[PDB]
Amino acid sequence: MYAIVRSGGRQHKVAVGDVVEIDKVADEAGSSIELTPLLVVDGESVTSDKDALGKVKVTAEVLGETKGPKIRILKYKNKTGYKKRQGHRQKYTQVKVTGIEG
Amino acid sequence: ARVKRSVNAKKKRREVLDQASGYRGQRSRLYRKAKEQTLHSATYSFRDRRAKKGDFRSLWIQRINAASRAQGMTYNRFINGLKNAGVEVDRKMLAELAVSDINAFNSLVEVAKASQPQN
Amino acid sequence: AIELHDLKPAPGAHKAKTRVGRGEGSKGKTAGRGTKGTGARKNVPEFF
Amino acid sequence: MSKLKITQIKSGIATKPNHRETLRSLGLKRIGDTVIKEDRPEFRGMVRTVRHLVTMEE
Amino acid sequence: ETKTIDVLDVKGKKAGSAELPGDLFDVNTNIPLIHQVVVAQLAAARQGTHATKTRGQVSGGGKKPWRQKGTGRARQGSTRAPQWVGGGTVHGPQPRSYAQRTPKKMVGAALRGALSDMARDNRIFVVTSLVDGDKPSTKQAKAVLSGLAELRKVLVVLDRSDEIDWLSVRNLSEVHVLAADQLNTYDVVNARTIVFSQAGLDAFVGARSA
RNA sequence: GGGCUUAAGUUAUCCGCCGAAGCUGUGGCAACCUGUGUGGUUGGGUAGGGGAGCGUCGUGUCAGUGGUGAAGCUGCCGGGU
Numbered sequence: 001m002y003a004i005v006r007s008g009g010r011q012h013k014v015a016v017g018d019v020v021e022i023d024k025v026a027d028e029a030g031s032s033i034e035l036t037p038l039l040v041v042d043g044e045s046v047t048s049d050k051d052a053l054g055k056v057k058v059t060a061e062v063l064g065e066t067k068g069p070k071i072r073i074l075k076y077k078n079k080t081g082y083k084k085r086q087g088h089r090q091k092y093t094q095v096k097v098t099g100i101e102g
Numbered sequence: 103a104r105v106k107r108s109v110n111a112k113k114k115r116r117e118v119l120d121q122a123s124g125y126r127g128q129r130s131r132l133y134r135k136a137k138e139q140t141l142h143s144a145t146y147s148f149r150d151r152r153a154k155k156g157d158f159r160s161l162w163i164q165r166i167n168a169a170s171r172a173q174g175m176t177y178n179r180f181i182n183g184l185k186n187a188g189v190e191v192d193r194k195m196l197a198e199l200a201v202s203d204i205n206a207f208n209s210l211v212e213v214a215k216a217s218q219p220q221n
Numbered sequence: 222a223i224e225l226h227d228l229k230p231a232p233g234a235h236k237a238k239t240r241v242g243r244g245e246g247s248k249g250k251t252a253g254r255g256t257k258g259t260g261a262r263k264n265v266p267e268f269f
Numbered sequence: 270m271s272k273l274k275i276t277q278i279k280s281g282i283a284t285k286p287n288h289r290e291t292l293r294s295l296g297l298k299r300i301g302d303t304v305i306k307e308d309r310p311e312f313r314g315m316v317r318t319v320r321h322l323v324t325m326e327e
Numbered sequence: 328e329t330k331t332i333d334v335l336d337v338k339g340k341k342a343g344s345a346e347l348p349g350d351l352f353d354v355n356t357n358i359p360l361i362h363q364v365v366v367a368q369l370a371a372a373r374q375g376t377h378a379t380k381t382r383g384q385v386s387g388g389g390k391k392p393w394r395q396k397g398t399g400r401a402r403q404g405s406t407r408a409p410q411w412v413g414g415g416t417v418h419g420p421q422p423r424s425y426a427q428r429t430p431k432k433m434v435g436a437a438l439r440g441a442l443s444d445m446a447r448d449n450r451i452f453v454v455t456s457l458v459d460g461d462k463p464s465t466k467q468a469k470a471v472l473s474g475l476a477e478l479r480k481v482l483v484v485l486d487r488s489d490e491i492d493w494l495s496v497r498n499l500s501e502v503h504v505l506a507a508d509q510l511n512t513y514d515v516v517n518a519r520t521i522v523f524s525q526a527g528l529d530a531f532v533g534a535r536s537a
Numbered sequence: 538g539g540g541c542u543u544a545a546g547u548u549a550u551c552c553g554c555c556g557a558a559g560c561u562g563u564g565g566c567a568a569c570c571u572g573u574g575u576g577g578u579u580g581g582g583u584a585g586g587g588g589a590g591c592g593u594c595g596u597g598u599c600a601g602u603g604g605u606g607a608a609g610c611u612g613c614c615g616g617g618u
């Protein structure tokens with residue numbers, strides 16, 4: 001039993017007990033969120049249509065906020081003297097999938 | 103107030119020599135030569151972080167094409183069928199299904215076949 | 222009871238000195254003069 | 270008055286300054302941007318001026 | 328505010344009373360003005376005896392080191408050119424004075440504000456004098472410790488013959504001694520308290536009063 | 538380029554898809570405008586103009602700290618646009 005779910009314009013193949021690296025959401029740690037499912041597979045049984053995917057709820061809980069890798073941008077063009085330094089971290093949020101109830 | 107440059111100067115040199123700590127020849131030993139490669143490295147990394155989207159989408163599309171052609175359906179017809187059926191599972195999850203859960207991918211192929219315009 | 226370490230200038234009273242020709246992230250290299258010509262090196266008299 | 274629906278389908282790069290100013294006056298700012306205008310002859314004129322850059326509906 | 332207040336002359340235990348004129352010892356404390364006056368003070372204190380030799384002042388270097396062309400070396404004009412080791416310094420320091428011509432009204436007002444801040448904070452004491460007869464440092468150390476703390480300013484004004492108080496407080500190293508005609512904003516701000524002699528306060532008030 | 542007429546050529550037409558740092562989705566940063574609950578617009582860039590900073594040395598003051606080890610040098614593990 002697993003679900004193709006969506007969260008923040010990006011999709012994940014989740015299962016109960018999995019830990020997913022979700023785009024940062026406002027809900028506080030230890031609370032629970034519902035991930036919108038786009039597909040459910042229970043083994044030789046594939047729920048795909050919107051009416052049935054409406055009835056299924058993928059519930060998960062927030063664990064904490066984690067940061068991505070530190071990215072170092074150095075925009076550069078030769079023979080002009082142009083440089084531009086920048087950095088990025090791209091915080092996300094841990095999620096633990098607790099249940100896929102049809 | 104005479105100021106000696108060395109203590110402040112060495113900082114960027116240490117930074118660059120650390121950033122260039124896998125390069126071949128002078129590019130990992132000499133600050134000036136390491137500096138030139140770090141400019142190229144940064145440009146390449148920026149370009150490739152944006153080309154990575156296309157590279158992985160191409161890989162997913164190839165795998166989906168192979169998996170659907172195994173079912174007698176081309177990639178374009180498969181994607182049009184999914185779009186008409188209204189299943190918005192993306193190239194990525196579809197490729198993961200093709201590699202891992204081939205039965206679920208084949209069920210999606212049947213969905214696309216049924217949702218074809220048949221015209 | 223000010224004490225000497227609480228004396229600070231009014232905001233905007235001490236503009237930072239612009240230091241020129243110290244990198245390409247500021248007025249660097251040509252030092253705000255452009256390339257070639259009389260103005261690249263000295264000046265032009267006001268009567269000329 | 271039929272409330273013309275105008276959307277930008279081509280970029281303003283390399284177009285004539287006339288065309289770019291017409292897009293600005295229509296309020297279109299990006300490709301795919303949509304504005305609603307009255308069925309007024311001035312707006313019909315802007316649409317026909319940038320007819321190669323936008324599409325119009327009702 | 329221009330309120331004149333009353334402090335009590337002490338001489339250790341108690342004595343008559345003295346008036347703080349108000350127009351000085353009670354005015355606004357313009358922090359930017361005080362900062363400018365103090366900075367100008369320290370700039371005037373600067374000595375500025377620093378110098379370097381330019382390429383014209385470095386010894387030697389008269390002739391062209393070699394021919395302009397044919398040698399394969401860079402064109403050089405003198406061995407004392409700035410880019411040479413041992414050559415002249417381009418824009419190194421030269422002797423100068425750092426004194427600033429701060430206006431009289433600004434300097435005085437700053438002094439008034441500096442005095443007024445700790446007048447309102449009650450850090451000015453007035454004593455008839457320190458020490459009696461002959462002069463020790465032990466005595467005044469006491470008189471002042473009885474006053475309060477040890478980051479002190481003393482005013483004795485009497486520029487010619489107040490040797491008793493001056494030489495008593497001269498060696499404390501947490502006391503700054505001044506004549507009333509030399510109060511200056513820097514020292515007033517640096518002081519945590521001021522103790523005036525009776526004559527010191529009287530002479531400062533007489534020198535400047537409305 | 539391989540190869541292609543058994544078009545993978547030309548042409549008319551129809552149905553799909555691929556395809557960019559364009560657009561959209563999601564998350565972070567920033568400039569400006571606006572009534573100031575919202576929101577809107579914007580952020581490629583040489584010469585160059587404006588704005589705000591990092592690091593080095595000296596120094597006033599205050600708080601200090603240092604053979605139970607300062608400076609410097611050199612690892613590791615981290616942090617910031």
Ligand SMILES: [Mg+2]
Pocket residue numbers: 079080
């Ligand atoms: Mg060029």
Ligand SMILES: [Mg+2]
Pocket residue numbers: 164
């Ligand atoms: Mg292929």
Ligand SMILES: [Mg+2]
Pocket residue numbers: 080081245249250251
């Ligand atoms: Mg430049």
Ligand SMILES: [Mg+2]
Pocket residue numbers: 250
């Ligand atoms: Mg350069």
Ligand SMILES: [Mg+2]
Pocket residue numbers: 253254255
């Ligand atoms: Mg200029």
Ligand SMILES: [Mg+2]
Pocket residue numbers: 251254255256257261
């Ligand atoms: Mg030039």
Ligand SMILES: [Mg+2]
Pocket residue numbers: 256257
């Ligand atoms: Mg040049």
Ligand SMILES: [Mg+2]
Pocket residue numbers: 256257
């Ligand atoms: Mg020229």
Ligand SMILES: [Mg+2]
Pocket residue numbers: 254255256257258259260261
């Ligand atoms: Mg010029």
Ligand SMILES: [Mg+2]
Pocket residue numbers: none
């Ligand atoms: Mg001119």
Ligand SMILES: [Mg+2]
Pocket residue numbers: 266
């Ligand atoms: Mg002249």
Ligand SMILES: [Mg+2]
Pocket residue numbers: 382383387388389
């Ligand atoms: Mg000479």
Ligand SMILES: [Mg+2]
Pocket residue numbers: 399
């Ligand atoms: Mg040579």
Ligand SMILES: [Mg+2]
Pocket residue numbers: 404
């Ligand atoms: Mg010469």
Ligand SMILES: [Mg+2]
Pocket residue numbers: 380385413414
């Ligand atoms: Mg010398």
Ligand SMILES: [Mg+2]
Pocket residue numbers: 155
């Ligand atoms: Mg893209």
